[PDB]
Design a binder for these strands. Sequence first.
RNA 1: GUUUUUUCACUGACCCGGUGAGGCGGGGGGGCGAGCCGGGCUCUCGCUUCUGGCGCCAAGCGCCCGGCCGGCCGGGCGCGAC
Lengths: 62, 47, 57, 91, 135, 98, 248
Amino acid sequence: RGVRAVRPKVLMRLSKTKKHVSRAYGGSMCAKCVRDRIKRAFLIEEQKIVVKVLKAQAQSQK
Amino acid sequence: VVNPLFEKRPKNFGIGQDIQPKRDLTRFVKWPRYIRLQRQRAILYKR
Amino acid sequence: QTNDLKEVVNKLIPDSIGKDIEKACQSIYPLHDVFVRKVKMLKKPKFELGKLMELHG
Amino acid sequence: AKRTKKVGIVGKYGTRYGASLRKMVKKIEISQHAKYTCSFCGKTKMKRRAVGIWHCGSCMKTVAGGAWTYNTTSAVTVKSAIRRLKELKDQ
Amino acid sequence: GKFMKPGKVVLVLAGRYSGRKAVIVKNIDDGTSDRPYSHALVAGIDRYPRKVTAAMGKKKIAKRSKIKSFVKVYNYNHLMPTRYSVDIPLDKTVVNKDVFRDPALKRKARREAKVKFEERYKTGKNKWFFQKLRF
Amino acid sequence: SLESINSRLQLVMKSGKYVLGYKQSLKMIRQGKAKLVILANNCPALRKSEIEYYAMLAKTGVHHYSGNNIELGTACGKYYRVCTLSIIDPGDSDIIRS
Amino acid sequence: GRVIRGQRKGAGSVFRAHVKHRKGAARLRAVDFAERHGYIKGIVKDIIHDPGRGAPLAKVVFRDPYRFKKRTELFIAAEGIHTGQFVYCGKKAQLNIGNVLPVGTMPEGTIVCCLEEKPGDRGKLARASGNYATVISHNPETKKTRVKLPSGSKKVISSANRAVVGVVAGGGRIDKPILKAGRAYHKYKAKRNCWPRVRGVAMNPVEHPFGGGNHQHIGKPSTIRRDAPAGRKVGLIAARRTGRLRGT
RNA sequence: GUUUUUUCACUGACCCGGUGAGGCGGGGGGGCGAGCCGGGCUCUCGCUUCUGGCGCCAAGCGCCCGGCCGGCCGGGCGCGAC
């Protein structure tokens, strides 16, 4: 959405705002798959800390 | 005095964790056919 | 599970497992000719020579 | 109504190719065109895109399956055997 | 229990500020006549302060360590709340819901959070919040 | 407790209050009304962790149901499929203890 | 005097393969440090159709360990691989389906495919649709393994070589009758000029050694010497036994 | 001894395969179980597997070196990466 459906060598003429949407991964990725990857980036990077804190508290009893 | 934003950010160069550092590969270069020749000529004097 | 392979055999030379089962089943149906009819060795760990010589001493 | 007595999807081949060949391809032609329940969304949207490649029209998830059926007998029993072999490697 | 408190850190899920971290300053769990939906006021950081390193100048570090904040009412489901908390004042007198009709009072709520976030970046407290989520 | 978890839902469907689906259940976690949030085992593994994380903040228990969204639908006595199921009131039931 | 069709086949030109719409070389991943000591993770981007090949392929994208670039591989897709599945490749990778690891580090009776006949050649054996090779038995001394090939012939294989776990996808396509000549035309049009197979007895005696005669017969024994020259070597090539197969 | 010969295996011509010839072989030092009484040997490991994110152009720590006025305004080299 928000990007002109036009033959690709015309894109030189088009203004910047005709070629992207004003967002992270604008005119490259859809809004749906960005905000599911803001979740996937987060919940994986949290899960790293969950095993990081367990790593030392699985070691420390030996 | 220690500026607390300055975080120690160590890289884990384990298999499939971080990128490998640009280390020394002098002994893994595909050498020219003359550099290759004059070295494995010196081997035949020792073999 | 509760003890090691040297201490199971000194239960197996008598009927320490073949008597325990006989007594504890008298209340369900009283049964007489209980043994442990066979023990088959499946999985040994990595062989260390010391533990073998400890069985022979 | 019920149109054909005992020819189904293979009514399109008319008199051609013989009964016992058309009787064979019907069991295939039903399966390869049949919509299957996608195990990833639950929707009956798994259709055969091409040969051995099955596509959920809801998930947009492509699976490498059998030619005329989503799962083959061989591939299932291998997945059961590879599971059972992995239950012995780690015990 | 109810976890969407004015102490929460929040990943902005949708909009121009997608993937940005923000602090809930107000929580309206049952919406008004203007906003039927359950909505929060958040104050987050549009431009994060760039990664700073020893053997950079005191003038260069100060230039490098600059927060550009936003202040924005979102839906709850257009936010992603986290276990983190940034217990920062962000006074209700400025950062407020009578900020969006008067444009100059949005520049001051933008200005207030800028002074507040820049000082607690420099302390080293809540150092997760001042690093961008990598998506 | 495989048919117990099926039967303990069937009674919550009759007597107690419940919410079917993801978006409406995600409010009942966020409104602090969720006591048990059940998930079907073929839900997106991203959105499985989305529920687990919200339920961790609200200190809500997450059950991982032993069937796909079609069976969880049949477990709810519904004529469709349901992944996410946040239970508000068990009523006259014993689902959120055991 | 005329050259037989088989000899014209080797010459090339009209019997060269139709590799226009054939989609890349269906190779394995190259042996590096993270194939030979531990493993490297990769996602299946899309399962894809390769014209002239019954089995579908998989665009599998591995992040590069040395440069910031990202690598893409075309695997003979194991049956049950799907898009967004994590495929692992190395010595320490787990024994589940569509997951390559060396034949040395898997038990006996293990079903594999895209098996390497030599360590490093990047996947040669058992990589047609619905085919599997069984890991028969190991030899830790000498580092070698017997592996039953799809034909049913056990090869001694050097255990330092790799195979993706599971049967190849597109399995059981030769069950369906090619009902009409149209389906056969279209099959071999994606491959090479081999289809409209004129039998030698129909041909004249100058083109083919079985041709000629007032009746349409072979005349000479159809079973031929292995040592026979090209042009002559026609029919049943070095037939140990022949005729209707009785016994096993 | 000399020569012939047979089987085991050697590499170094010769052949093959892969790669952008990207970590080969030995040794050393940090994990892990086993073994006598803080010390030591024959071994084992080397970091990533709940998710269709993300990663490169170094942080850190040492070490040297050029003005205004021991204090501030900028460069190099070593490890990290044996």
